Amino acid sequence: TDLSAQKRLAADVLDVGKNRVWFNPERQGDIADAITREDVRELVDEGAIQAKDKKGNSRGRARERQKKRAYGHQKGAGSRKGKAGARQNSKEDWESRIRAQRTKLRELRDEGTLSSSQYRDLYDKAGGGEFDSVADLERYIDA
């Protein structure tokens, strides 16, 4: 008894993979008489032809590792593979840092803290990279 045709029809009607269809080992003769697509549909509702479930890669261990790396752990010098400029991009780090300092000095000019001349002094120096972070910018504004 060849049920390979029905296996092709079962996988289209259940819209699932060919390797996932299950045929009841006890109902072979009744699956053998299954000529049409409707014959296959009826045999699905009878429970004789079912579909197995698709597996998923259990992210359980991954999530518990995402926790520790976000806290600063496991990123030791024996777990780094790519070079430094590969782990964090230099041009992208500047974009992050400099906009952060250009978002600061803007909020200071439009508040009255800094004057048009004091803002210019710092913007050109920020663009010149005289300040490391926003914290070093503040440690310069305050005398």
- The pair of structure tokens assigned to 139 is 């440690």
The continuous run of DSSP H or E covering 33 comes out as none
Q: How far is the CB of 133 from Mg ion (least distance, A)?
A: 18
Pick the closer one to RNA by CB: 73 or 113: 73
Closest C-alpha among 57, 56, 34, 58 to residue 45? 34
22, interface contact from Mg ion, RNA, none, CB < 5-8 Å by kind: RNA
Q: How far is the CB of 115 from RNA (least distance, A)?
A: 25
Q: Within 85-124, which residues bind Mg ion (CB under 5 A)?
A: 90
56, interface contact from Mg ion, RNA, none, CB < 5-8 Å by kind: RNA
65, interface contact from Mg ion, RNA, none, CB < 5-8 Å by kind: RNA
Pick the closer one to RNA by CB: 56 or 112: 56
Q: Which residues are CB-contacts of 102 (< 8 A; sequence separation ≥ 6)? A: 123, 126
Burial of 80-106, coded b for 16+ CB within 10 Å and e otherwise, reads eeeeeeeeeeeeeeeeebeeebeebbe
Q: Summarize as ranges the residues that interact with RNA (CB under 7 A).
A: 1-5, 7, 11, 16-25, 28-29, 35, 52, 54-57, 59, 62, 65-66, 68, 73-74, 76-84, 86-87, 90-91, 94-95, 128-129
